[PDB]
Structure 1
């Protein structure tokens, strides 16, 4: 092994001490940097929510004017009910986004402001704890220099007192009364001084070993426990907890707006399911009762006191009435066969139209995954054209059948099948 003196031992120690001081400074720089990052995030969070509140108010105002626009230019009928509920949903959504903006401004932003301010306080105090820790550790490292130096001085004195003693022992067996006595008292004085010096050296070595033990314990405690604890117990005090609550306030606000919106959309879905042409027609006909009310039946009006009120089927008129009845009947048979054919065409075409207009083409889910028209329209048009043609035809046929049947039935009543 090396034979080392004070200058070298001290310098080699000083090297590691300066390394530790350098590492302590860096630890402080890392901590400062992490604090500046937290302060910056909290500032970003404030600016993010301030701007979003503004965006939300704008949206809200625009939705309000959208609803007002149509609520100013003004019911029982199912499509108007859908419309009413559609406008109500806009009013509801407008209010909800104002509420959102208020929550951002009055609840969420102040939490970030408060946490920023608290973090300012907290980090100043945590850094003070940190500096106390580093100051005590440096104090301990700096105490070791003199402890070692004392051990080095006293050890050297012990070595050189041993030199002067051992030569005075070699000079003892040289002269071995006048001179023999004189070098005896000499080697005696050396023996005393060595003994004293060996003792001083032992005690200083013991001091050094004791101090070393305290030094390693201090270094270990700082690096293995105190740094970690400083972060957990000081720097991180309240941070994650506060951020959790602030962000859960955001989530609560959103969840509630979504629940309110869902409610609104469900009311529109109910209205849409209540779309009902025949019920709307009932409502219309009842509203305008007097428009649709049937007139009193026309009655036979006796002229100049006429006693008779029924068909007269006596001779000679009976034969011609029988002729007529038969005439009406066969003609009605032709017309009815023809009319049924037109009816069946009209009904089949109506079905086709129903197929066209009830096509389930409303699912727009594909539009939310991010990772020819004129020919069907012309076909529907031509189908509807043919439909109205057959409808007009059907109705004219029916109108003639109604008149002829009515006359036939009155004759049948009077005449019977056998007369």
Structure 2
């Protein structure tokens, strides 16, 4: 192994390290461009997202305000009222969601976009200070082995001259060559010293490289994230999460109001509220009272003989005639209640769950026609029931007045 063979071998190893170290800082420059790219991507994203949220908010207020530019309340009207109210509420929530995007979310990105710029520059500062400190230890070794090569070559240079002086000799020739041992032991002691120093120099340099690549490099990676790159983004994103979570609770609150307006839709309530509004239209008029002629003294049914027996005849005959009419007016009403239930069981169907629509028949024309045959029949049963009702009223009214005057004797 020649004097230059060793120096060229280390110099090739080191030229690689200088190439590696410079490519390590180029690697950090990529990751800084990446950091500021993502933050810019986030900025422009929420800049357009806020634009779109406010655009959505605008259209919903336009819809709600158009149907309120036309503006006792019934249950279906109240459902409609809470439908327009929700739309006006949801729009207000979206203006605020857009404000959070611009005044809260984005100002974090502009701050961290400057922080990622500034802290990288300060990290690279330590980075270059560490690279230079290592490069010191590397080029230190250059002069230490050059010392070793020189001292070891001189130790063998005295060793060859000693074996030639022993070849010739073994008057003053034996006494003269005595200084060859005095200079060989000198050169060997020195070559031992330079070997020692170089051996400790290697052990120093080997651990120096070790602690850079393993510790200093790793420590510097987490350094520009410690600082708190994750910690600052945790907040930025949770600000967005809380914003969308508060929109979720606000939409849900209004939706349960519509849902409750659907619950406490009542037919009996709409019947009463309509007649309370028009108390004069559905006003029951004054009963037709008995008007005597010329000042007629009698006011009740004069059941005097011989009309008593005629009234006895009619009353006992009306009693079985009203019984027969009622018997067959109901077992009409019973069919009319069956038909009503039939139409009711068609309309009381649970075809509202559209859960199938979010997951990733020709007989309909006959069912609809079938509904308009049952309704047609329902009315023809009602016309039949009410027409029969009219006569039972005029027959019962005559019968009950007959019973009070007399009875059945």
Measure how far apart 1:156 and its partner are.
0.6
Structure 2 unmatched runs, 5+: none
> 207-216 or 331-340, which moves further after superposition?
331-340
Q: What CA distance in whole angstroms lies between the structure 1 residues aligned with 2:224 and 2:102?
A: 30
Choose 409-418 or 152-161, whichever is displaced more.
409-418
Q: Report the equivalent of 1:297.
A: 287
Does the 8 A contact of 1:82 with 1:271 survive in 2?
yes
Point out the more displaced range, 259-268 or 184-193. Answer: 184-193
- The reply on whether 1:396 has 2:384 as its aligned counterpart is no
In the alignment, which of 316, 320, 336 is matched to residue 306 of structure 2?
Answer: 316
TM-score under structure 2 length normalisation: 0.94
Alpha-carbon distance in structure 2 between the residues aligned to 1:115 and 1:98 = 25
Alignment of 1:182-197 (within 5 A): 183-184=173-174, 186-197=176-187
Partner Cα distance (2:295, 2:105) in 1? 97
- CA deviations 1:128-159 (Å, max 9, x no partner) are 21222122212211111111011101111111
Identify the range of structure 1 (262-271 vs 200-209) with the bigger mean alpha-carbon deviation.
Answer: 200-209
Q: Is the 8 A contact 2:312 2:408 kept in 1?
A: no
Mapped pair 1:117 → 2:108: no
Retained in 2: the 8 A contact 1:45–1:112?
A: yes
Aligned partner of 2:271 in structure 1 is 281
* Aligned partners of 1:89 and 1:261 also within 8 Å: yes
Structure 1 unpaired stretches of 5+: 174-180
Between the aligned partners of 1:409 and 1:209, the Cα distance in structure 2 is: 135
CA RMSD of aligned residues (A): 2.1
1:224-269 per-residue CA deviation (whole Å, 9 max, x = no partner) reads 2111111112355111111111001010101100011111111111
79-88 or 241-250, larger mean C-alpha shift = 79-88
Paired residue secondary structure (1:275): coil
Separation in structure 2 between the aligned mates of residue 117 and residue 306 of structure 1, nearest angstrom? 110
C-alpha spacing 1:50/1:84, structure 2 compared with 1 (3 Å): same
Residue 191 of structure 1: CA displacement? 2.9
Q: CA deviation at 1:71?
A: 1.2
Distance 1:331 1:193 in 2: 159
Give, in whole Å, the separation in 1 of the partners of 2:141 and 2:176: 37
Identify the range of structure 1 (344-353 vs 30-39) with the bigger mean alpha-carbon deviation. Answer: 30-39
Over residues 15-58 of structure 1, what are the superposed CA-to-partner deviations in whole Å (9 max), with x where a residue is unaligned? 22223233323322332222222221111111211111111111
Please name the residue that 1:178 is paired with: none
Work out the CA distance in 2 between the residues paired with 1:237 and 1:185: 77
Matched residue, 2:406: 415
Which whole-Å CA distance do the structure 2 matches of 1:163 and 1:416 have between them? 164
Q: What is the distance in 2 between the residues matched to 1:303 and 1:335?
A: 36
The answer to whether the Cα contact below 8 Å between 1:75 and 1:81 also exists between their aligned partners in 2 is no
Q: Deviations over 1:177-209 (max 9, x none)?
A: xxxx55346413433332332233222212212
Distance in 2 between residues matched to 1:183 and 1:143, nearest whole Å: 45
Partners of 2:108 and 2:298 lie apart in 1 by 101
Matched, 1:356 2:346: yes
2:8 to 3, 6, 11: 11
Calculate the TM-score normalised by the size of structure 1: 0.92
Asked if structure 2 preserves the Cα contact closer than 8 Å seen for 1:5 and 1:152, the reply is: no
Name the structure where helix makes up a greater proportion of residues: 1
Deviation by residue 1:292-320 (Cα, 9 ceiling, x = unmatched)? 23222221111111111111223333343
> How far is 1:169 from its partner?
2.7
Whether the 8 Å CA contact 1:168–1:183 is kept in 2: the answer is no
Q: Secondary structure at the match of 1:235?
A: coil
> How far apart in 1 are the matches of 2:126 and 2:112?
20
* 8 Å Cα contact 2:72-2:277 kept in structure 1: no
CA contact (8 A) 1:53 1:101 kept: yes
Secondary structure of the corresponding residue to residue 71 of structure 1: coil
- Aligned to 2:372, what secondary structure does the other structure show? helix
Deviates more, 1:386-395 or 1:34-43: 34-43
Offset of 1:332 from its aligned partner? 2.0
Change (3 A) 1:75 1:83: farther
- Aligned partner of 2:98 in structure 1 is 101
CA deviation after TM superposition for structure 1 residue 321, in Å: 3.1
Query: 2:200 maps to what in 1?
Result: 210
Which residue is equivalent to 2:135?
A: 138
User: 1:12 offset after TM fit, Å?
Assistant: 1.8
Q: Which piece of structure 1 moves more, 4-13 or 213-222? A: 4-13
Taking the aligned partners of 1:324 and 1:206, their CA distance within structure 2 comes to 147
Deviation at 1:118, TM superposition (A): 0.3
- Per-residue CA distance 1:358-415 (angstroms, 9 max, x = gap): 2121111121211933322222222111111111111110001100111122223334
